Write a protein that binds this ligand. Structure first.
Ligand SMILES: O=P(O)(O)O[C@H]1[C@H](O)[C@@H](OP(=O)(O)O)[C@H](OP(=O)(O)O)[C@@H](OP(=O)(O)O)[C@H]1O
Length: 107
């Protein structure tokens, strides 16, 4: 997936992403939601894309209260047969902001 530079951005910012497997650590990456796609990078320069997701197929949901994953403010984006993304926002305000935007893209 390629990002269109001259396209408006719905929201962008830091999120923590859990490793698919391994020691299951949280990596802080810079995320950008442009169009119905989610792109992420190393930092806020938004220079080289590290990964991307076509949201319309996905289901994105809050893991609920209580830090059940070991961190507060986590949510999960999944769709059977595709890669699951486990994400964490820094604050409730950031989580709400991301959930609202990601909902609009997926639908
Ligand atoms: O090298 P180890 O110790 O195994 O951990 C890797 C790196 O942190 C990768 O980032 P980078 O290669 O850019 O430093 C990351 O991919 P991302 O860069 O896409 O975040 C992987 O997360 P996954 O998305 O689960 O593969 C994670 O498993």
């Amino acid at each position: 997936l390629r990002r269109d530079p001259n396209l408006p951005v719905h929201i962008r910012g830091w999120l923590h992403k859990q490793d698919s497997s391994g020691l299951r650590l949280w990596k802080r990456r810079w995320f950008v939601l442009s169009g119905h796609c989610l792109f992420y990078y190393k930092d806020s320069r938004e220079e080289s894309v590290l990964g991307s997701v076509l949201l319309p197929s996905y289901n994105i949901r809050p893991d609920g209260p209580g830090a059940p994953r070991g961190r507060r403010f986590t949510f999960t984006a999944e769709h059977p047969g595709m890669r699951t993304y486990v994400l964490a926002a820094d604050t409730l305000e950031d989580l709400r902001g991301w959930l609202r935007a990601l909902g609009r893209a997926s639908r």
